[PDB]
A paper describes a structure:
Thereby, we determined the structure of ScElongator at an overall resolution of 4.35 Å. The reconstruction shows an additional, unambiguous density for the ScElp456 ring next to one of the two Elp123 lobes. Our Elongator cryo-EM structure reveals that the hetero-hexameric Elp456 occupies a position that faces the active site of Elp3 and bridges between the enzymatic subunit and the C-terminal region of Elp1. In detail, Elp123 and Elp456 subcomplexes interact with each other at three individual contact points involving Elp1, Elp3, Elp4, Elp5, and Elp6. The first contact point (CP1) is formed between less conserved residues of the Elp3 rSAM domain (Trp341 and Lys342) and a loop region in Elp4 (Tyr369, Ser371, Gln372, Lys375 and Glu401). The second contact point (CP2) is formed between a loop region of Elp4 (aa172-195) and helices α27 and α28 of the dimerization domain of Elp1 (Asp1160, Gln1164, Arg1171, Tyr1254, Arg1261 and Arg1265). The third contact point (CP3) is an interface that is created at the three-way junction between the KAT domain of Elp3 and the C-terminal residues of Elp6. Characteristic densities for the iron-sulfur cluster are clearly recognizable in both native and crosslinked structures of ScElongator. However, we were not able to identify densities for bound SAM or 5′-dA molecules, which were present in proximity to the cluster in the previous cryo-EM structure of the Elp123 subcomplex. In addition, our ScElongator model also clearly shows that the tRNA binding loop (aa1176–1251) of Elp1 is displaced by Elp456 and would not be able to interact with the T-arm of tRNAs.
Numbering used by the authors:
A (entry chain G): 67 to 176, 231 to 416
B (entry chain I): 5 to 273
C (entry chain C): 94 to 557
D (entry chain A): 387 to 482
E (entry chain E): 2 to 233
F (entry chain H): 2 to 232
The structure:
Amino acid sequence: GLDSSHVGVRPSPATSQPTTSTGSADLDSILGHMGLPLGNSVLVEEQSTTEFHSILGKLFAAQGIVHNRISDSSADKTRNGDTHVIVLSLNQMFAKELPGIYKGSRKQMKNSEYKDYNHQFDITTRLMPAPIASELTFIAPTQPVSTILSQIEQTIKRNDKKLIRIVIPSLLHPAMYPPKMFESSEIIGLMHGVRSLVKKYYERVVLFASISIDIITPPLLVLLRNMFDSVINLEPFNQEMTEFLERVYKSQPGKIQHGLVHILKLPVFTDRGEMRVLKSEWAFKNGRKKFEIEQW
Amino acid sequence: QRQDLVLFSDQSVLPAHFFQDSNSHNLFFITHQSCTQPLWMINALVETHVLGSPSSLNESSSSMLPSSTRSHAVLASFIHEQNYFTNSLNKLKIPSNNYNVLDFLSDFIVNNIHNKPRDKILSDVLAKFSAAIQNNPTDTIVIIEQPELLLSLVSGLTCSELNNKFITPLLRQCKVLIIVSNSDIFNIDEYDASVHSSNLQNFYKSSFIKSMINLNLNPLKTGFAKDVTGSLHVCRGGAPIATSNTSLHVVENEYLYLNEKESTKLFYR
Amino acid sequence: SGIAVVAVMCKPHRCPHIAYTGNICVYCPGGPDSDFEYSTQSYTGYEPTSMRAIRARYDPYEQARGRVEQLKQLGHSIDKVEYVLMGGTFMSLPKEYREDFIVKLHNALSGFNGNDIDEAILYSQQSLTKCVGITIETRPDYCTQTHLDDMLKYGCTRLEIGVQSLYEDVARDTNRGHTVRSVCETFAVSKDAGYKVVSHMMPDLPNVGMERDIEQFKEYFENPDFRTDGLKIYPTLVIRGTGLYELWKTGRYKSYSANALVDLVARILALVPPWTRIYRVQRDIPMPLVTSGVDNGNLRELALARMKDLGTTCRDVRTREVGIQEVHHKVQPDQVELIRRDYYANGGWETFLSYEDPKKDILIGLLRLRKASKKYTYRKEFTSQRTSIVRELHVYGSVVPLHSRDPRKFQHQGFGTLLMEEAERIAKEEHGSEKISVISGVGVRNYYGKLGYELDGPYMSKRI
Amino acid sequence: WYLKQELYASDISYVKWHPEKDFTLMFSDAGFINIVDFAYKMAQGPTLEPFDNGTSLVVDGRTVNITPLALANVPPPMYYRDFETPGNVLDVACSF
Amino acid sequence: ASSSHNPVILLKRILSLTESSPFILCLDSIAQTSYKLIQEFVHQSKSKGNEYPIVYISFETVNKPSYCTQFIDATQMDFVHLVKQIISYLPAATATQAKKHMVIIDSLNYISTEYITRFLSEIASPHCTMVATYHKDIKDENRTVIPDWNNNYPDKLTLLQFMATTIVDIDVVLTGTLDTEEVSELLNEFRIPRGLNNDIFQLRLVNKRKSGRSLEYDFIVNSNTHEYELLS
Amino acid sequence: ASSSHNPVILLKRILSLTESSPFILCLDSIAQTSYKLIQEFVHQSKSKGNEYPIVYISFETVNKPSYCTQFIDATQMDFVHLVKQIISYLPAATATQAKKHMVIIDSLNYISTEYITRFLSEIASPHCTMVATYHKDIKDENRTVIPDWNNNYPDKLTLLQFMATTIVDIDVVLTGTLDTEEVSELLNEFRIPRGLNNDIFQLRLVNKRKSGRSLEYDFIVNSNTHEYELL
Ligand code: SF4
């Protein structure tokens, strides 16, 4: 075959398949594979105007850079891990927003040999420092789709060795996306071609994206939700439940949560005909270290 | 516990004499709720057409490789790619050489459909099957998968033009047609697609009028359980049976089905 | 008609099983030691019966008389009342208290003003406003033979002995003083005396999973030891004053969601044998003081929707009852048949006879019969020869209309005689008995004295 | 539990049941592959009117238990009019 | 008066074309398709012996009808052609003394409203009998018409109910454990339960007469023995 | 620094413009217009001892009010010139939080949705403090959403609610013996019972704060004695 570099991957306990890790604490646990299988995208959603999900949109990408930056004369194994993260946004603030490593610990225990796994993260600490254009690139979304589709393929082809991680920060935000692209054909064809490219290089490519649904008509949401292979929804509590919790919780600041989690679609589990929908069972919380998902 | 899967009066799922009768056509319509996928039924249909029995539900699946069989099978889809079809359906062991597999996703979007006249697109997408079926004319079965998505791809297309340019010519040329799709458009909570989104629902209603049998895979009611996954419905479609024998009709029954590790189980309440 | 239930209360006390474990069982709320301190255990004192008991300073005479007069004044006229006692363990109290309590409870209705309980019950037999039994709550450690003789003399008819689990760690970790296995011998000795026995269960408990909850109920219904004539299901709700709230405070406890509990109830109701009366899945709770759990007012209202989506709806007595007269006689019933079931339970063979409609599964009348064994009987009435006991007669077949040519102006007044002679047939032929006995409340000692049964001790018996 | 059936041999190597089918087990005998099969069957006496009394026969090790139905409805767990055989039992029949 | 003293006789006279009817309209839906009524026409109008050309103009149907004698596929013709290659088979508006034929239109939902009346103008003759079915569960396309505040004209249903001289409505008789409320619901979310699309059906008849009010009755029609029963 | 404000004190704080955002939305109907709302703005804003220079944008207003200093009328002239003229009376500097040029708009119904953002992207300067008003009952023109299968764009109300930092809406209290059901019945008949356009109205307020969360506030407002109380 051809040369390939996997920046970090372990066998899937559930089905013995190559699996990466988003770097999250319990989101990777609830993905069914104790991680994200190599090839299946994911989707996370938020009900209200809050921006909890934005935090996640950083973590994943940062993880890849770490998995690439702690191999250059910092890993004794010197194992072949290379990533070229692509960001599709009209603001470049992310180039100086990656959070900092806490203490490392990429152990997985409880072509090369890949033992790398999730690290330890904290939100207050910024990264030291941040990748150069040779590691990570920004593409504005407002350009016509032909150029974008040619350029993504060119980027992947010219960097065959590297593992591919793609992040779409807040797709369909009206402050950057004009109405001339809200037309039905445009975005759906864009994602149809993106799925074609992603599954074409099924060996190593992974994509991540998130949107806001409060301002999107249900038909477009239904059209979009069949493009991906996993859907997670986060619904924050109402004001009244928050006040009830704070009135009751008097001895714990850490027991305070923000909302619940709903599972709409999973990785390959669902394509074999599995009813995996499960709602109103989990609870999410943003924390100083990572993102916690527990039972409620 | 387990019960047999019978879909006709002759106690056979897919009658052989259907392929033996000239000057006839038939259409099957399958709808699945998009929380589940009907792949485990497409497999059974292909096996029962080629091997003559349901080779995954009622029969063992240890020799499942129908490649180079006297019969034939043609599958085409938009939702997935050639790479997925080959790798997966061969990992599912769906045949290759006595078989045809058609993608319309990988590299097809990129300026191969976009920015081109619609008439050429429709003519070529029809000619693909019009040429891919010339080889074996009378011992094939063809299934299309969720073709209504193409409606949202072509710039400003209604149900009528797509139907009369793609579906009816395909059924006129070929012996029997099977169309499978999903029905989330009818399942948006506290929202009416009848307000202004009726264009897509027109396709579903037209297909159900033209269909002969109607297969429904639907999820369970309010909750989610462990021992049962979904409900299976069989119904008589709109069009009558174009056979030549008179005693033929359709059996009428409902099943409860569980799916686990590609293994499916059917039984009664 | 006029069936009446008048609950009474006993003075506060302490169950002695605390002595060898230290405190009350974990789930028991309130109590004398708690902040309330004027209230019997397992009752917060905020119930309407608690209010009516406090103002009377826990006296049976006043409570009974006041409740009876209130019910009579509301608009219903009463001639058949069944007493039920509540609170702690009534049998623990000294000798004279129970005697005086029972004598007062009988003289309230009889109008008698004497003592020497024998005379009180003798006068209560020949009285208007007949009493149809008593329901005494007691624990396994207090069901010895002397106490059973006491209850038989008093006039009690059915007990309710809770078990709360079948596992063995739960008994010690919940500070309840009895091994699980002894309850089986308690049932065995009790049943041979003719006492209908009902139990309790609580689905969720600490260190118990959904699985173990499922197969504990399955083993309860399948094993020939835990086959009893009734059930009560109490979903676990956490009151602040209980020992359960401490576990949640220390974080050593968590509960089920709504979906899990409704699924569990749906599964459980799809297994009930057709001779047990599920009393209340939708029990009565102190609402605002609960801190953990879920709402329980309409659990079955959703469980029914669940069985309609999975099949195999419930088959208990309660859902299939038609009642004494015109409850569901808006439509003329269908084919009426006699159905007879036999089962082995607690070292003996027992028979259940019923008159049912088989096409739609309704119930009209039922009877229970037991063939006395030799390894459990001790009464001088039952230790002289073979005998059989009619544990319960139940005739909702007092219905005036019916299917298949009901009696015109006789209207099923001889319907019960059919079942009585049916029982006597198999008593004479199959059991080979030489004496048949029936247990009943003292107030109804004449509806059985016309068929020939004669009185011996607390029993209504006749030979063969 | 009842002792429904015994099997006799002079050697054993290993025993394996069947995944899909049941009541068909594996065993060996000095290198000889052997397969057995079992099925439910309920013993019953005569049915015709001149001698119509349902007699149910059950086996438990060295003991045989009887139950004449329509003369007694004795439940499964307790039985009626036993007799103890010197050896175990593998099949039983009744007369007319 | 002294003619059609029983509703069944009127129905049979209509079906067998004993009395000429320039236009007749039949309504159906998904709950009960409308190809049994063509069988009713074929069977009843043969007792009088109408073997006259039963043209079957088709827009969507894939199969060729055996009970008919002609077959025209209109997925490639425009309006003017569609009128023109039908006047040949039909007794066009010439030969003022001639016979009459049978016309079966498979579907009415695929034709734009803008030409509807003209499709009944160029062909209407005392020699032709138009029969067509209307599916009521398909809402037509109205982006082209742009129904703004200054571009208005009546909708298809009213025009169809107006230019018709006889109207028949088709319904499926409820037999098992399904009632109209839950049936319409399940159709709305497309679960299609058992108890649908049988041969035994029910009809509503509205017959219009010149200079007077129309008559409205109901019927129970079986598609097995071809026998009728008027509403009680 | 002050924090965890008293809800009435907080209502004053926004109304006294101690806090400020580059966009504020106010809603009105044909039952209670917002002139007294601007009266409350100027009453509790200049009472702090502040001038607050005002620029006025009118699409429904007919006469120059007393609130504004400068003036511009936008009915005769169009978007391509208003994008110019807005900057003439509005410097591009910082500090919305204090005495700057306050740009007020009387109506927002008469601007095409396709250019709502292109407008607002060029006005909300860090010196600029924008407040605008929208008529709820007036139906949007049919040519702003293009109800075809192509346009997935949202309507005008949700776009404004998602974009504006703070939302304030008002309604008129009917002191009469009527019910709002009857008021709606008559208004659907275009009938006006006596008791509309009063001075003691009710208000609903929402502010986006703490990284995006929101809390809904309701009160009772008297616009003569300037009395704000809880409801
Ligand atoms: S035995 Fe009864 S009264 Fe005693 S602690 Fe337990 S629940 Fe309370």
